[PDB]
């Protein structure tokens, strides 16, 4: 149980790019002396008479193992002991060897994985390997969770020719008492529960490999946590012995330039739904609130310098954009198509790709829109139009000759420069309820709002701002369309009341917003249920009480101070209380009489 040489592994599946020779050299360079593959092991497109002997050094794959479209006779993974299957091939496979043959049905004969004893997660699949010998004799039950071969091999089970390639059995022969794996059939032979492939003895220090984490020369279910439970305070303190996880290893410090997941693991880069920030002194991954930031070029910029409009051909390129550098221009030709360039008409529903757009730095010029839409719903999340464009007229917002009945620009809070023109929209109401000047950031900005539906005709039809709106007007008739609320709001909706004394989920009010009480707060009958966020601000706990905390269950095994665990029991009033220090697996009541 030591540190081992680590490599990254690949995620290319079945892609070929170069010559078989270049590809083979890439593999050789990658896995050279590699003992632990942090990712996947993809062995593809290796041809006959190529030497893959370096693969003999590989002992662990963290991801999946893919062996496909090879014609080489031998793949010598003789020392591969475990595939953890933390990533899957084809949505379900940790091990997949597929189609290792050419049109002559010649190819992979020898896959002597004589030390492969554990596949932690994932499935196994062998397909179309007409030259593969002996692997059909394997008893996979010993490995996966839920010539002829030597006569000495157990039940005719073997990975190859020799006695040395007889399958080693460490699970299915084990006594009924054993949790996990063994060295022999006796209850004396059982391995520690944390052992992965087999053991050299009964202890955590004896395991051949670890099921979860390796902290030094010991296997553990988890790494020493970064935070601790403090029984005196019922709160969480920093752990001075805490460690982060790096692959299946516990480490005091991440390698460079790695970052730390919320899960406390060391990774090279944060995930796609996340952003990075260093707080505090640690480079951390945090999940994005809303769509992750993404700047895209607008119409008349870069690749779109000679593009008339948003249209069928370019629309999907705005997918996930949150800020547009430059303009968005939408013109009648978008919806008509262009027959001469085979530009199809824009599918109206594709316009909802623009729902992620919160900012446009230039101008928003809308001169056409599908007639069956009643508002500019695609731009319901647009917050700012900066109007910085310097060579395309005076208007930063144009809404011209459309069929809409409301603007629906629910999130719009600033038009920093440029004039606004809203003209010729014969069904359009609500536009005069807005004090446009309050949106402006530049002296003298102007509006030109005319030849829309008449204000008096709108009033007479009931097309007015909702009763729950403030006097600041609205973007449509709904309580979500108000510029601001009469009083309280729940999310983006102006509402007549928060669920203080009645309704579910129960709430409190914070700066005129209805905020949900914590789920552990028990709803009170015609009386408030909480005074603030979280499980310490409840009037009454729904289940158990742990100090100031309303909790779902009492703490049971959590890491405490002095390198100990914390166990608690619940009394008749549902209050949590410390177990006696010597009930190291928990208790049902106070004292030694609590842990018989």
């Amino acid at each position: 149980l030591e540190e081992k040489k680590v490599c990254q592994g690949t995620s290319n599946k079945l892609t070929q790019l170069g010559t078989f020779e270049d590809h083979f050299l890439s593999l050789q360079r990658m896995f050279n002396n590699c003992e632990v593959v942090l990712g996947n092991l993809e062995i593809t497109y290796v041809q006959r008479n190529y030497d893959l002997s370096f693969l003999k050094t590989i002992q662990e794959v963290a991801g999946y193992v893919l062996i496909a479209l090879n014609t080489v006779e031998r793949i010598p993974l003789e020392n591969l002991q475990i595939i953890r299957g933390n990533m899957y091939y084809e949505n379900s496979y940790a091990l997949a060897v597929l189609s290792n043959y050419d049109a002559n049905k010649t190819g992979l004969k020898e896959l002597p994985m004589r030390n492969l004893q554990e596949i932690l997660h994932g499935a196994v699949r062998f397909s179309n390997n007409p030259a593969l010998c002996n692997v059909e004799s394997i008893q996979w039950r010993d490995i996966v969770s839920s010539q002829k071969c030597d006569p000495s091999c157990p039940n005719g089970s073997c990975w190859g020719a020799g006695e040395e390639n007889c399958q080693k059995l460490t699970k299915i022969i084990c006594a009924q008492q054993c949790s996990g794996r063994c060295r022999g059939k006796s209850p004396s032979d059982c391995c520690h529960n944390q052992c992965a492939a087999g053991c050299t003895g009964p202890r955590e220090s004896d395991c051949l490999v670890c099921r979860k984490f390796r902290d030094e020369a010991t296997c553990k279910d988890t790494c020493p946590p970064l935070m601790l439970y403090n029984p005196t305070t019922y709160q969480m303190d920093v752990n001075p012995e805490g460690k982060y996880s790096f692959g299946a290893t516990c480490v005091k410090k991440c390698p460079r330039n790695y970052v730390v997941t919320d899960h406390g693991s060391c990774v090279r880069a944060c995930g796609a739904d996340s952003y990075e920030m260093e707080e505090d002194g640690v480079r951390k991954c945090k999940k994005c609130e809303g769509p992750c930031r993404k700047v895209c070029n607008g119409i008349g910029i870069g690749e779109f310098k000679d593009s008339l409009s948003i249209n069928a051909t370019n629309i999907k390129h705005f997918k996930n954009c949150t800020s547009i550098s430059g303009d968005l221009h939408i013109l009648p030709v978008a919806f008509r198509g262009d027959s001469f360039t085979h530009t199809p008409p824009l599918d109206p529903q594709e316009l909802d790709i623009l729902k992620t757009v919160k900012e446009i730095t230039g101008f928003l010029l809308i001169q056409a829109w599908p007639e069956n839409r009643t508002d500019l719903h695609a731009f319901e999340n647009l917050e700012i139009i900066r109007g910085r464009t310097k060579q395309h007229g005076q208007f930063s917002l144009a809404v011209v000759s459309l069929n809409i009945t409301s603007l629906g620009l629910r999130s719009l809070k600033e038009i920093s420069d440029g004039d606004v023109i809203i003209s010729g929209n014969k069904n359009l109401c609500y536009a005069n309820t807005i004090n446009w000047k309050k949106l402006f950031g530049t002296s003298g900005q102007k509006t030109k709002i005319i030849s829309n539906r008449g204000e008096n005709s709108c009033k007479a039809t009931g097309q007015v701002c909702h009763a729950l709106c403030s006097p600041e007007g609205c973007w449509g008739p709904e309580p979500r369309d108000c510029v601001s609320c009469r009083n309280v709001s729940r999310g983006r909706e102006c509402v007549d009341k928060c669920n203080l004394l009645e309704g579910e989920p129960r709430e409190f009010v914070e700066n005129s917003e209805c905020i949900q009480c914590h789920p552990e707060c028990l709803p009170q009958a015609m009386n408030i249920t909480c005074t603030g966020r979280g499980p310490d601000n409840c009037i009454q706990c729904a289940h158990y009480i742990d100090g100031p905390h309303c909790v779902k269950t009492c703490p049971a095994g959590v890491m405490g101070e002095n390198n100990t665990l914390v166990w608690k029991y619940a009394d008749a009033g549902h209050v949590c209380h410390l177990c006696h220090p010597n009930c190291t697996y928990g208790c049902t009541g106070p004292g030694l009489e609590g842990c018989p």
Epitope: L308, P332, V333, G337, S339
Partner: antibody, heavy 122, light 113 residues
Framework: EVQLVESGGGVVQPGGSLRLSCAAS????????MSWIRQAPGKGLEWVSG????????YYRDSVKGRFTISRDNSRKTLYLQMNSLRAEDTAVYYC???????????????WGQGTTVTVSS | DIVMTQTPLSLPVTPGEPASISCRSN???????????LEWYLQKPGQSPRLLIY???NRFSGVPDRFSGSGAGTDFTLRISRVEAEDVGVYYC?????????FGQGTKVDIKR
């Protein structure tokens, strides 16, 4: 029904000028791209020019470019081909044709006019 | 321009019998978007041209299944399973894939006697 009725054809000297008209009815004209196609005495069909429904862009066959101008007046549902600097090789029957498949996803033309004849000789 | 070659240029046909017209371009007609804009038009005597087939093998509305098209790349064929007397006229293949769009010279189908 959809109709396309052409006029304006006639006889003209080399270097002279004519203007063809194509009057549309029975559909919303401004929703459709339009083309002119011609057929000389001994040849097949030859595409000459095209324009978008709202005139945002026009297209011309090279041998015609700079001598012909395509245009449209959507308020009168009418398509035009202004022909100047007329050469002998321009003599043909000229058709207007509607791009029935918007954005040419399927096919180039559905409806055609009845044709108008242009003869250029001295 | 893409040259479209029709063979034959003259086709007497016996009514009730099959007929076939070949169209070959001097350049592949597969567009970058994946479609092949190869069309057949028929010009009946005293009438304007009218679309028969589009995208190689699709019959325009109103066109009977006696007409079919096939082919790919640079090689195409119009087939009439049984010719009717009302089918006489001039058939044109047409390419809308590359600029400028072009027609073949036209195959005149008439009556065999």
């Amino acid at each position: 029904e959809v109709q396309l009725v052409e006029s304006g054809g006639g006889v003209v000297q080399p270097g002279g000028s004519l203007r063809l008209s194509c009057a549309a009815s029975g559909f919303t004209f401004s929703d459709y791209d339009m083309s002119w196609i011609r057929q000389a005495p001994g040849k097949g069909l030859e595409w000459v020019s095209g324009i978008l429904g709202g005139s945002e862009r026009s297209y011309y066959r090279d041998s015609v470019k700079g001598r012909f101008t395509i245009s449209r007046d959507n308020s009168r549902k009418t398509l035009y081909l202004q022909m100047n600097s007329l050469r002998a090789e321009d003599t043909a029957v000229y058709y207007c044709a509607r791009h029935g498949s918007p954005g040419y996803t399927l096919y180039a033309w559905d409806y055609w006019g009845q044709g108008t004849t242009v003869t250029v000789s001295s | 321009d893409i040259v479209m070659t029709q063979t034959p240029l003259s086709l007497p046909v016996t009514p009730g019998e099959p007929a076939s017209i070949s169209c070959r371009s001097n350049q592949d007609l597969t567009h970058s978007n994946g479609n092949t804009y190869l069309e057949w038009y028929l010009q009946k005597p005293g009438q304007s041209p009218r679309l028969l087939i589009y995208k190689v093998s699709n019959r325009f509305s109103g066109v009977p299944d006696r007409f079919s098209g096939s082919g790919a790349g640079t090689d195409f064929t119009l087939r009439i399973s049984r010719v009717e007397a009302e089918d006489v006229g001039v058939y044109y293949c047409m390419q809308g894939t590359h600029w400028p769009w072009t027609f073949g010279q036209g195959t005149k189908v008439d009556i065999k006697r």
